[PDB]
Amino acid sequence: SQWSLSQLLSSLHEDIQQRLSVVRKTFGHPGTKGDASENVWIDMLDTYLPKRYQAAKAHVVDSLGNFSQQINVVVFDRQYSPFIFTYENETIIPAESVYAVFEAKQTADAGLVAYAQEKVASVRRLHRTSLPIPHAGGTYPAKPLIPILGGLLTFESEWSPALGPSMDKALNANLTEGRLDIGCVAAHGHFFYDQASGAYSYTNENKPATAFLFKLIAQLQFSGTVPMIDVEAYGQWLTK
Amino acid sequence: SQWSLSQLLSSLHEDIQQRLSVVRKTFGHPGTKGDASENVWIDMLDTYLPKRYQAAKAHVVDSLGNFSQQINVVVFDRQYSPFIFTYENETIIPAESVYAVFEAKQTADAGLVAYAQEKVASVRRLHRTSLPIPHAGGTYPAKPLIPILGGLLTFESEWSPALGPSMDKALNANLTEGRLDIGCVAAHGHFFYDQASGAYSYTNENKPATAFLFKLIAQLQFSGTVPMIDVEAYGQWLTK
Amino acid sequence: SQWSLSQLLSSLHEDIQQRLSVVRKTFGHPGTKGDASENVWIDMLDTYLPKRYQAAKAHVVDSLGNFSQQINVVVFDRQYSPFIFTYENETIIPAESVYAVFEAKQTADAGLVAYAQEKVASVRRLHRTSLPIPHAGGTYPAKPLIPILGGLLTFESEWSPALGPSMDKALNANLTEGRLDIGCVAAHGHFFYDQASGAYSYTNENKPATAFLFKLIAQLQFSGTVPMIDVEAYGQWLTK
Amino acid sequence: SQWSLSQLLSSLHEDIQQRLSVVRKTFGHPGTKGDASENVWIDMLDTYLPKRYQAAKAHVVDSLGNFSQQINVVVFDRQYSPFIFTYENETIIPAESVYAVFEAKQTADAGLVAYAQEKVASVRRLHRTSLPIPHAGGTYPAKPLIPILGGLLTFESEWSPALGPSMDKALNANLTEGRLDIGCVAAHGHFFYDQASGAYSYTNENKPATAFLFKLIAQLQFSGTVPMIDVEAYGQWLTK
Amino acid sequence: QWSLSQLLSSLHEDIQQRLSVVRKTFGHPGTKGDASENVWIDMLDTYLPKRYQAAKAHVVDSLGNFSQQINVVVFDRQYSPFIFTYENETIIPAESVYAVFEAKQTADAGLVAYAQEKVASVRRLHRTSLPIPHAGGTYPAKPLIPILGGLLTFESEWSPALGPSMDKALNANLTEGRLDIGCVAAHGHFFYDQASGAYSYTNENKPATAFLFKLIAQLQFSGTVPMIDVEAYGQWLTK
Amino acid sequence: SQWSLSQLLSSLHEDIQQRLSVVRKTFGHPGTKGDASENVWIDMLDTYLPKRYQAAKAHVVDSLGNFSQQINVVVFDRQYSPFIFTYENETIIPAESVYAVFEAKQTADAGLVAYAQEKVASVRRLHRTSLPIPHAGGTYPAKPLIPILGGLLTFESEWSPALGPSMDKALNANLTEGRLDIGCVAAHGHFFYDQASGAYSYTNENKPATAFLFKLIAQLQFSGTVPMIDVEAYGQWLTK
């Protein structure tokens, strides 16, 4: 009956780990298991992230007509950004709306790390517009393009411990367009890329999903709001 | 990744036990903990019971103007029954709509058993009308009044054994208006009253919340649908 | 402090009268005022009628291709009946689904009574199919067609007293296809057509909206469920 | 301007065909296109079927521990049937709840017909319990088991004519556990198995999605409500 | 295989198709109008940035004056209260408004004039504007934003739809009732070019999508609504 | 018929007073009455406040692990702030999210004023972080903390006049950490603390709930958006 902040943060994490564990052992069909697992991560972000952020599955498109791969957990703006197309509950968002790109799967291994790196690169390669921003105090120059964070969300790992030499090799194989900035292995720990030191930081236990959530919120704060989209750049495709 | 019926039933139970456990250790304020605990039990019944059943907190009233105590988990009909009054999300249902009456609290002990028995009695004492029932085949005579099931829902038990002779004593103290027909102690097992043998049956472990849910569904099937309410009996209070 | 069934019934009515009063004096556009008033009546029925009944605005169609007028408050089945067409939140239901037809307007007068009678007649003139009914015991012979109840719902009356000779004259002008069986003038009383005596019964005050609701439920009970629709009769209109 | 029953039925169909056509030409990822297409069919059935039917994706389980394949469009009862397990929006239903099983894909061809027949057979092979049914008039004998309807939903056909001899040969390859009783090829027509004649009936054009919907409703009516489930048979799996 | 051009074409085709079904299927005029408005509101609710709300409403100002009924208004709720909402009908303050549209099935001279009067009925309202507290301190009160006016239809009575007859109708009001943007879903879109002082017309080219993109681009210049002085409304609290 | 701004404001208030009056006389059980009364006030704020404000029941926690009392109506940010924990519909928010704190009860008296003062103090004692704010134009200095508004919401008063010497005495007993800045006695008037004069301002009648709402919105505007939370201060509790 004593309130405890540590207990709140532990329970947030325990809920995520428990739900992912139930999904893993109970749903026999791999597609069903994957859909339910993604549902957990999207629910966590929808529940806890500031409401300036949306979290969903989508494809990303740019004004040059290029498309990302399917992103199973994308974090994006809707306060200042349209969808490009949404129909029958499937969605394509403009590249200018994107804050972060994650690949979610039940188990981390070398193939999944490389797959996530490529998913992230498929978004970062897209072209983003940026217009001068009218506001209450006048007009800002166009905002410089924000970083798009990349990451991986799993329950388990092929490696034990999950965050060891094999994971470190896999992550360090792509520190450029496919760089993963943050990730969570819910049964084991979380990681983030420290730009000041140029290396990954790993934490085992210590409430992994909550640690991931808090690091993501803090990292996202540096991005501010997405730059202002030039929708008329997309409008060039109305005639061709 | 193989499908297992036993795993489905185990996961249903484990989810309930886990949510109640998180509520108990995380919410320091008693009212908050109680409200969250009741939310779990109501969510379980709303999710799994056949849709002919509603589950909610309510008071019960009869056409004699008498009221039950507050029932924190009542199972009732809405397909054939009106509310008597619902306002600002608080609700009063007619006695004729009731299928089952539960008291949900943290731990089973002598005082809670007696309190739950009195809650159930406060509903069974109410008067229920019953009219001949028009249907596709003609008209049935008024349905004989259905039993109202009584029950208790807890996480823990103060007794040792949890479902042992001390519990059996408290339950056998009221086999009439306050009789409890079914109950769940989520950390320990479930019980039910066997009318054929005139005694209680106890089962330890065996996925307690799922075992409770399945027994409740089976017991409810015997009640069929509620008898047909005479709403004009309540209308006698329009001139009073 | 003390529970009172009479108070529950009074408050139910007072809520409806107050909401209609606020709509009447506050919305200065006639269409807005009408829409808001209809919303009150539909909310009352949706909240309190047994869930076997739907309440909404709709047109009604039959398998002979005939359409009713627009019905602003129709009570109908959806448990056993399809929509014929629903699109952009506007709806057409089959005649076999209908239990009751109401016209809602702010004030009762000679023109409104005649208008409501014509609305009801426009539904009663429609053809209703009825098929033998498969059920748990086998197949019942086709259910004989149920009466469709007709009515009016207003707040005020041009006549003072509201339910006097002028109302009785208007109501008795149509006792066949346009007969109104039940009605509520929320600020004054309710009426119903007594088939045994062949005359209207009027009740002033006595919590009019609650009195109306209880009479409507009691009258509807005699209809049971709608007869079983022959959807293939509508399917005759699939040819080019 | 003028109401037309033929137009209502034509617009219902045209809406389905247009939505499926947009999905087909607009979503460039196969999983996304498939999900959106299934969404259209499920939306159609959820919107228009009587509310006694649920329509969703699910797996089916029986009281012998056997599971079906993943069913992308299942029509089932929830008024009288629990879920066996639902978690993170993915669901397993008992075999006793099932009315109809469909496979939904883009184009009809020999492989898809055989795949759909096997999907249906994977449900029909499951064991279904049936108990005596308590009701207002006493207790019915256990209801004899109802057929489960099987079907196929597509947009196009690889064959010319679409519903021609090649389709007929594929359908006639399984008239037992995998028999398809009804199907829709949205751009071309619909089919149904005529038990009296022992052969398939094909209808080209005539508003295919509406014709399919009406035939499905008429077929389903013969099934009445699902027999009463013996949940205690599932409870045998509660033991360690 | 994906195509951005196809996305934009399908967005428009969906709107045109839904409006076409409504027009031919709902025999009752009120039902047809309600369903058509539902399409336009759904399009804007789905695609506009979430800083914009789209609904039917009346507009009121702190001087007690009311607009006509606006069947499609685009307005702020992030920084603005409702003045009154009850039984799902709503009155918004003038300070919340970004854009005012009249939606009907067919464009003709009477509809253009009616839409211009609807827009004027909102622009005549008084809007307050207070200094704005924010993360950096307090901005001076924001100068009042233009309220955009427009029309949304499916068809046109004229040949061509956006031809000389439409141009005459629009040019009859370039002041308080000026329409800045509009869509004739079966034919094209128009906008008022302030630099040249004339209307620009675009035929085909996915009309509803072209309209949506131009609307978003025009709205961006308005930023957020100025900060309402709700206590100006409070003068009507006395007996 | 004629629109009237005066009437809009009168109806807004009259709706609140009517709903609170119905709750007071209709719900016999004190807990039910209190929940329904809180529901009215939360609905009013959720309906009318700008969407940058959330209104709900919650506990508040800070990065030092300290907790407030239970707050039945808190007004807070979610656009830029996470929840710390939300589970089974019960919620804990960070102190940095808070704009205003209210205690809502049916009747004002000396005990309640002191209780509301203690509730507010329990939130104001909490520590609030504030980081430099990234935005479109660069980075702002950390926003200075702004004081949290405190308040009381009731229907009636033990005193007549309600806003008389006894109320003034109770309010002036705490002008520091427990100071109430604004309040409404719905049947009588509203009050606010005038910082310029150092005294309370009382307004009788003048549509109290509307007058309260407008003063609240005006006071809140001065607070702008909450300062930017340092979630890593909370993350210190991940490892302890």
UniProtKB/TrEMBL annotation, chains A, B, C, D, F:
Residues 24-126 form the DUF6602 domain. This is Uncharacterized protein ORF C62. The gene is ORF C62.
Automatic annotation (TrEMBL), chain E:
Residues 23-125 form the DUF6602 domain. This is Uncharacterized protein ORF C62. The gene is ORF C62. The chain holds residues 81 to 319 of 319 of the full protein.
